[PDB]
Design an enzyme around this catalytic site. Structure first.
Site, PDB file in Angstrom:
ATOM      1  N   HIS A  24       0.840  -1.186   0.000  1.00 33.90           N
ATOM      2  CA  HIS A  24       0.000   0.000   0.000  1.00 33.90           C
ATOM      3  C   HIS A  24       0.875   1.236   0.000  1.00 33.90           C
ATOM      4  CE1 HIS A  24       0.951  -0.761   4.239  1.00 33.90           C
ATOM      5  NE2 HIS A  24       0.894   0.551   4.371  1.00 33.90           N
ATOM      6  N   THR A  44       1.647   4.395   1.917  1.00 32.74           N
ATOM      7  CA  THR A  44       1.489   5.117   3.180  1.00 32.74           C
ATOM      8  C   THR A  44       1.429   6.583   2.794  1.00 32.74           C
ATOM      9  OG1 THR A  44       2.751   3.416   4.327  1.00 32.74           O
ATOM     10  CG2 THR A  44       2.406   5.488   5.490  1.00 32.74           C
ATOM     11  N   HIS A  52       5.247   6.808   0.533  1.00 32.38           N
ATOM     12  CA  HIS A  52       5.995   5.736  -0.121  1.00 32.38           C
ATOM     13  C   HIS A  52       5.152   4.479  -0.073  1.00 32.38           C
ATOM     14  CE1 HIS A  52       6.911   5.404   4.179  1.00 32.38           C
ATOM     15  NE2 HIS A  52       7.000   4.099   3.950  1.00 32.38           N
ATOM     16  N   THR A 104       5.859   0.695   0.711  1.00 35.53           N
ATOM     17  CA  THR A 104       6.842  -0.290   1.146  1.00 35.53           C
ATOM     18  C   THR A 104       6.630  -1.585   0.377  1.00 35.53           C
ATOM     19  OG1 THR A 104       7.008   0.704   3.328  1.00 35.53           O
ATOM     20  CG2 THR A 104       7.752  -1.598   3.101  1.00 35.53           C
TER      21      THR A 104
END
Length: 144
Positions: free
Chosen positions: A27, A29, A106, A108
């Site tokens: 996902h 963030t 970002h 991850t």
């Protein structure tokens, strides 16, 4: 001085991401927040106010990088008008948003060291936007 570390984040899930990944739920963030428990409705209200703009974001990605040792992530591009609008909305309601010193939105990909990859700028398709406790559970989700 300083700030309360965040206890929640706003996440954005996509139909597809264009990178190999090892995390279970990849996902974006999008932002991080500290929310007092009596303030969850206030945050949810702001997310709903911003819902159409969030879902309209022109989000692309084109490269990956090591955020820190053992945290390998993909960039996003195109969310900052909305990011800073939201910063302002949360601020006006005295909710601490974006108080992390090193935080940049970002995706991850893996909790491991990986070589950087670059692809053509690639449009991501938003499937869900949600509010989730850091190291905890989701408490609010929206689609469309």
């Amino acid at each position: 001085s300083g700030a309360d570390d965040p206890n929640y984040f706003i996440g954005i899930k996509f139909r597809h991401i264009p990178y190999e990944y090892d995390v279970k739920i990849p996902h974006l963030t999008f932002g991080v927040l500290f929310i007092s428990d009596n303030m969850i409705p206030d945050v949810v209200e702001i997310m709903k106010i911003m819902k159409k703009e969030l879902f309209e974001m022109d989000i692309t990605t084109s490269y990956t990088y090591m955020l820190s040792d053992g945290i390998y992530v993909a960039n996003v591009s195109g969310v900052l008008a909305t990011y800073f609008k939201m910063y302002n909305l949360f601020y006006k309601s005295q909710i601490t948003f974006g108080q992390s010193r090193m935080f940049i939105p970002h995706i991850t990909l893996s909790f491991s060291n990986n070589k950087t990859v670059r692809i053509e700028s690639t449009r991501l398709k938003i499937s869900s936007i949600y509010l989730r406790k850091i190291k905890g559970d989701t408490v609010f989700d929206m689609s469309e």
